Amino acid sequence: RNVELQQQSCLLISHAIEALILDPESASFQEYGSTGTAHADSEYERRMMSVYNHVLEEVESLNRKYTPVSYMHTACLCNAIIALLKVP
């Protein structure tokens, strides 16, 4: 689960690059994760999925609101880096 969490972290960063820098028109489909029973076994897993949900919501909320050369795009992605690294 820890290895899967790291893989999901870098997948999240790659998707955050793609959906709001490279091609916001082609990307940002109905990627609404069915967050029902969050059966996270550890506190670390809870923090990682909370960070993932927050970053995905920020990406979806800032999908096409700006031109692809944006200060908000770099700021939200570059603070997603901080949110991912804040949890030890």
Binding site: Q8, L11, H15, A19, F29, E31, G33, S34, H39
Partner: protein, 236 residues
């Protein structure tokens, strides 16, 4: 006939306990599959109906286990197929439905309709699993339209026994079908994912006489290590 009575009792125990938690449903299905397998190993004349019902309950168990995976709790970009379980589950249900339809002698229309219903459920599960891993919109729309075409073919072929499948996958599809043509395909995938979990488990009408199609070959007799020599490029 104590064995026939036990088979009926185990099947109705499965049917009448379809309101449990997923773990309890998996436990009940595993218990009944084990009991049906051992009953087939004991009563020879009921072996065919025993493993017929066992394959049906294995299909339902695979569907339940696939619908309770960890991939539904993660988003589409965070989905990863290298730890996937539902993709193999849909393929296994397809194989078991074909095995059920064609290696059993005593099948009829009243069983073929449930077999094809389980095939439709497996196709829907595979559609949602493939929709999880697709980022483009047009291939997802393509096999969503193909799946709706398959559902239309099913309602056209089996229109006679449609009023026997109460609260199932196909009739609850038929209620929402005019919405389903006009819905965006990602919303179609989402409503299918939320509607498989709410679909009611069907019942198998037990055939009077049914046997497995069995085949064993004896003349090759694969227990001799002596090679069968011949000239290269010629025939043996």
């Amino acid at each position: 006939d104590p064995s026939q009575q036990f088979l009926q009792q185990s099947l109705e125990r499965v049917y009448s306990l379809q309101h449990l938690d997923p773990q309890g449903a998996q436990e009940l299905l595993e218990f009944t599959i084990r009991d049906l397998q051992r009953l087939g190993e004991l009563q020879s004349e009921l072996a065919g109906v025993a493993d017929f019902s066992a394959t049906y309950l294995r299909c339902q168990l695979l569907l339940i286990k696939a619908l309770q995976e960890k991939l539904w709790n993660v988003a589409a970009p965070l989905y990863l197929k290298q730890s996937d379980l539902a993709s193999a589950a849909a393929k296994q249900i397809m194989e078991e439905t074909y095995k059920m339809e064609f290696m059993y002698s005593g099948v009829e229309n009243k069983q073929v309709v449930i077999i094809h219903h389980m095939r439709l459920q497996a196709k829907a599960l595979q559609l949602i699993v493939t929709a999880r891993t697709t980022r483009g919109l047009d291939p997802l729309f393509g096999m969503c339209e193909k799946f709706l075409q398959e559902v239309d073919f099913f309602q056209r072929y089996f229109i006679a026994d449609l009023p026997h499948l109460q609260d199932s996958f196909v009739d609850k599809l038929l209620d929402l079908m005019p919405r389903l043509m006009t819905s965006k395909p990602a919303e179609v995938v989402k409503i299918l994912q939320t509607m498989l979990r709410q679909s009611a488990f069907l019942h198998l009408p037990l055939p009077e006489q049914i046997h497995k199609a069995s085949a064993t070959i004896i003349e090759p007799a694969g227990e001799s290590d002596n090679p069968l020599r011949f000239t290269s490029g010629l025939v043996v």
